[PDB]
Amino acid sequence: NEEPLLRKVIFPIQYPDIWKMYKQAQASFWTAEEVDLSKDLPHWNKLKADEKYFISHILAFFAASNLVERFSQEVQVPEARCFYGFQILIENVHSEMYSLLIDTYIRDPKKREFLFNAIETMPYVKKKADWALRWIADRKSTFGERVVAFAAVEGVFFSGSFAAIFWLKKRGLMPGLTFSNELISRDEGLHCDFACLMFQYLVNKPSEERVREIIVDAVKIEQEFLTEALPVGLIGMNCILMKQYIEFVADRLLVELGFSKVFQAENPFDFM
Amino acid sequence: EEPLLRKRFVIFPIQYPDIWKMYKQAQASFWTAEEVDLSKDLPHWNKLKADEKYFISHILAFFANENLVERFSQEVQVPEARCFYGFQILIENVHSEMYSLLIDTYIRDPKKRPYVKKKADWTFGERVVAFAAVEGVFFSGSFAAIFWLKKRGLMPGLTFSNELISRDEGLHCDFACLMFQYLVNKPSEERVREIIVDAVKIEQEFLTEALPVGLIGMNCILMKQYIEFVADRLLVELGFSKVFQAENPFDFMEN
Ligand SMILES: [Fe+3]
Ligand SMILES: [Fe+3]
């Protein structure tokens, strides 16, 4: 309780800018039903064996993916709690959408079964697990550290896959997948932005050194996935350029938290 | 332990269609505070008596917890249930914003801007019922009081917000009953009564001793009856029998 966010009639609003972001969340409310998948199987069938493997897998990883309930309890400002309550909900809309997309492109139930049991095995899930239990759950962890981890989960992890799905939009393919990709990644941006806003109200925040360790570690994990394990070559993208994008994204985040760049990586993707 | 408390990778194909249908119903009743127009209430408020202002402000003060759903939501494993609870969390935030706006609209003077204690102190199944009780028994008499204001044609912002909020609590309370059905081990009829009947006592004391509905022209004996009626309706919903046998006295609460 040295911290304004942490210390124990919502109106009038004390924090207009926390509140403005809640209001932006509400403004952009949607449901998985809103998204039209009727024109997708034709485009899907035009994809090649390697591109279907890739798309079906990154979807499964999106689906495989509860720290927000913890922040909502911990943070004591009503304005913030409203934003986290909306975040809980919209995340559940994300899951529905991924389930819908899979069910639309993987029609046979046993194929879905093979697919998911594979994905539980894989490194990307274990590595992201180990990272969160290292930087969130450790309980030598601090609140400032968790805020930075929180921001990374939203803005570094899956950043490369949103980009991959945007690359397909460039080629006029799969309008339901790409349209839902836009809504979801927009939602993540806002969530990443909110975490960066909270970080600005901290009395005790972590060393630039420490902020780099959390962030650059996620970059390690995300780059490995999309270049080593499930390479973007599978859908005609360049690996080197993707590693660079992940770093541009991570540099942007460091600067949002008020620190200097580490990688100096420019954005390689016009379409982004 | 229990199906609702035990362990999914992908929502579809839906497993508990009845719980899912409730989530979809919640989604279909989405609203925000700004959709309720409070710009004709102050003139009405200024025409009220001293005792009507007293009553309305005080119930609005007690209207102004979903810590508990941030616990149910974490404990329940069935994805369809977790979806409903997510949406419930959102809607109670809409409710609080609504009640803050109302207070702010009528009690413009900052300086001006009990029952509380009895609620505070007051197995998964027990918590479900106590949870159902909060939605259903607590504040049911306050909902009826504002439906009385509507019958006299007063305070249209308050009364409309009340219709919306009442409807949500109905759904939220119904949902706690659907959860209760799915329990394999549930407390006996004896425990439910204790929880529901303690609830009724607290609510009855509140709207007839501390802050009598007589202040807005209502009959207390009848308000006591209606609270008992709501409690009865809950007991039967949870799969038990009535304890009070109370008829709903209010013709205006019949739609
Ligand atoms: Fe998110
Ligand atoms: Fe409720």
Total helix count of chain A? 12
Q: Would you tell me which CATH topology of chain A applies?
A: Ribonucleotide Reductase, subunit A
CATH class of chain A: Mainly Alpha
Main sheet attributes: strand count, strand direction, barrel closure of chain A: none
Strand content of chain A: under 5%
CATH architecture of chain A: Orthogonal Bundle
Classification by helices and strands of chain A: mainly alpha
Ligand types: fe (iii) ion
Beginning-to-end CA distance, first to last residue of chain A: 41 Å
Helix content class of chain A: 55-70%
The interface involving the most residues is between:
A-B, 31 and 28 residues
CATH superfamily of chain A: Ribonucleotide Reductase, subunit A
Order of helices and strands of chain A: HHHHHHHHHHHH
Q: What is the subunit organization of this protein?
A: homodimer
How many beta-strand segments of chain A?
Answer: 0
What is the global morphology of chain A? globular
Total number of distinct structural domains of chain A: 1
